Design an enzyme around this catalytic site. Structure first.
Site, mmCIF file in Angstrom:
data_model
loop_
_atom_site.group_PDB
_atom_site.id
_atom_site.type_symbol
_atom_site.label_atom_id
_atom_site.label_comp_id
_atom_site.label_asym_id
_atom_site.label_seq_id
_atom_site.Cartn_x
_atom_site.Cartn_y
_atom_site.Cartn_z
ATOM 1 N N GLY A 100 0.821 -1.191 0.000
ATOM 2 C CA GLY A 100 0.000 0.000 0.000
ATOM 3 C C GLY A 100 0.859 1.247 0.000
ATOM 4 N N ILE B 132 2.130 2.845 2.619
ATOM 5 C CA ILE B 132 3.263 2.695 3.529
ATOM 6 C C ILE B 132 4.234 1.637 3.021
ATOM 7 C CG2 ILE B 132 3.912 1.974 5.850
ATOM 8 C CD1 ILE B 132 1.547 3.398 6.942
ATOM 9 N N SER C 60 0.563 -10.269 -1.376
ATOM 10 C CA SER C 60 -0.820 -10.287 -0.882
ATOM 11 C C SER C 60 -1.848 -9.873 -1.929
ATOM 12 C CB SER C 60 -1.019 -9.424 0.365
ATOM 13 O OG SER C 60 -2.323 -9.587 0.899
ATOM 14 N N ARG C 61 -3.077 -10.373 -1.753
ATOM 15 C CA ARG C 61 -4.203 -10.148 -2.652
ATOM 16 C C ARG C 61 -3.890 -10.634 -4.059
ATOM 17 N N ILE D 290 5.558 -2.844 11.876
ATOM 18 C CA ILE D 290 5.045 -1.498 12.086
ATOM 19 C C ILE D 290 3.533 -1.445 11.923
ATOM 20 C CG2 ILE D 290 7.155 -0.218 11.619
ATOM 21 C CD1 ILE D 290 4.590 -0.521 8.860
ATOM 22 N N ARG E 65 0.118 -3.888 13.225
ATOM 23 C CA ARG E 65 -0.608 -4.141 14.459
ATOM 24 C C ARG E 65 -0.018 -5.361 15.151
ATOM 25 N NH1 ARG E 65 -1.810 0.344 13.725
ATOM 26 N NH2 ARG E 65 -3.904 1.244 13.459
ATOM 27 N N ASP F 94 7.548 -2.354 16.781
ATOM 28 C CA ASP F 94 6.896 -1.138 17.241
ATOM 29 C C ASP F 94 5.536 -1.395 17.878
ATOM 30 O OD1 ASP F 94 6.981 1.696 17.548
ATOM 31 O OD2 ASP F 94 5.579 1.913 15.878
ATOM 32 N N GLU G 129 -0.510 -3.911 24.115
ATOM 33 C CA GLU G 129 0.171 -2.680 24.479
ATOM 34 C C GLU G 129 -0.531 -2.030 25.671
ATOM 35 O OE1 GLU G 129 0.650 -2.010 19.670
ATOM 36 O OE2 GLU G 129 0.401 -0.260 20.969
ATOM 37 N N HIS H 208 5.182 2.011 20.157
ATOM 38 C CA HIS H 208 4.224 2.409 19.121
ATOM 39 C C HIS H 208 4.372 3.892 18.770
ATOM 40 C CE1 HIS H 208 -0.029 1.449 17.340
ATOM 41 N NE2 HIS H 208 0.778 2.028 16.468
#
EC number: 1.1.1.26
Length: 312
Positions: free
Chosen positions: A152, A154, A173-174, A229, A231, A255, A260, A278
């Site tokens: 994407g 990022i 992916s996808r 980076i 979830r 991260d 958390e 994070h």
């Protein structure tokens, strides 16, 4: 105007101060439990401002029947019942693009900090151990293969930065993404087997939960490093710790974590891991841009103007 807005957690002082000034602000943490808010102000809340920590789940959406919009202080939507929002005519907005650069910057920093043991090197100097001998040799980044889960905004920004380090780039992916020269892999196990740096850069859905499991970690191997980076639920966290303890994984630059701000105790003593609280989007510049975008979406909504960054 002074419209009822629910702020889920202390995201940002400037955003909180503007919400208190422009709207009728309800601070979710001013109530001992969620039901203390729902029982006292069920119909008072027309907008919810959340983030990646507390969003708008099915229970909250149904407990606030007058809710009109969810404006997220985040790019991620895994804390918002998007389908229920569309059913009940509730708009949802996020903060795209304004945090791409900073999150991509942090992925590249974790790669260098893990491969070159920068945080360990810093502890080495400050403990006085440089007087005894040279620090251990580390691992060269330039030229190493980078595999990105999710191409994407990022993910594509991370790849652009790694290319300056002469890194071969592959992604997964996808469906195969058009207009890229990176190597597409139909499976994460094959992506992990053919790269030494595995970067999580995808959205958290039921499909991508635990996308880094024991099988992908074993495919990565003791010469590889996990960079997360995204979830904390993207990685089977007890398996990641076990593989690092047993030497099945070389290192990890993390991260985000499962619960958390809790970080597994076993990771705290490891020199081959880098752990951040994070901080992906946590710069003065980006957080200001995110705050102004959330405020811009709320203002446009309640003025009957087209939203700025709508998702549904």
């Amino acid at each position: 105007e002074s419209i009822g807005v629910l702020l889920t957690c202390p995201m940002n002082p400037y955003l909180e101060q503007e919400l208190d000034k422009r709207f009728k602000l309800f601070r979710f943490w001013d109530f001992p439990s969620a039901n203390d808010l729902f029982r006292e102000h069920s119909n008072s809340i027309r907008a919810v401002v959340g983030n990646s920590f507390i969003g708008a789940d099915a229970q909250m959406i149904e407990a606030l029947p007058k809710m009109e919009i969810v404006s997220s202080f985040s790019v991620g939507l895994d804390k918002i019942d998007l389908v229920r929002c569309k059913e009940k005519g509730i708009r949802v907005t996020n903060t795209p693009d304004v945090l791409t650069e900073d999150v991509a910057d942090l992925a590249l920093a974790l790669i260098l900090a893990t491969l070159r043991r920068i945080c360990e090197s810093d502890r080495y100097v400050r403990s006085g151990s440089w007087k005894k001998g040279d620090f251990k040799l580390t691992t060269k980044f330039t030229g190493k293969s980078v595999g990105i889960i999710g191409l994407g905004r990022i993910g594509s920004a991370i790849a652009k930065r790694a290319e300056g380090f002469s890194c071969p780039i592959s992604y997964h992916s996808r469906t195969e993404k058009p207009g890229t020269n990176y190597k597409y892999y139909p499976s994460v196990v094959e992506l992990a087997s053919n790269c030494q740096i595995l970067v999580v850069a995808c959205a958290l859905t039921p499909e991508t939960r635990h996308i880094i499991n024991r099988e992908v970690i074993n495919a990565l191997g003791p010469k590889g490093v996990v960079i997360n980076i995204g979830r904390g639920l993207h990685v089977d966290e007890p398996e990641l710790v076990s593989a690092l303890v047993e030497g099945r994984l070389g290192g990890a630059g993390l991260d985000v974590f499962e619960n958390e701000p809790n970080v597994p105790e076993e990771l705290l003593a490891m020199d081959n891991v880098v752990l951040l609280p994070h901080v992906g989007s946590g710069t003065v510049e980006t957080r200001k841009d995110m705050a102004d975008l959330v405020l811009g979406n709320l203002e446009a909504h309640f003025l009957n103007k087209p939203l700025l960054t709508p998702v549904v």
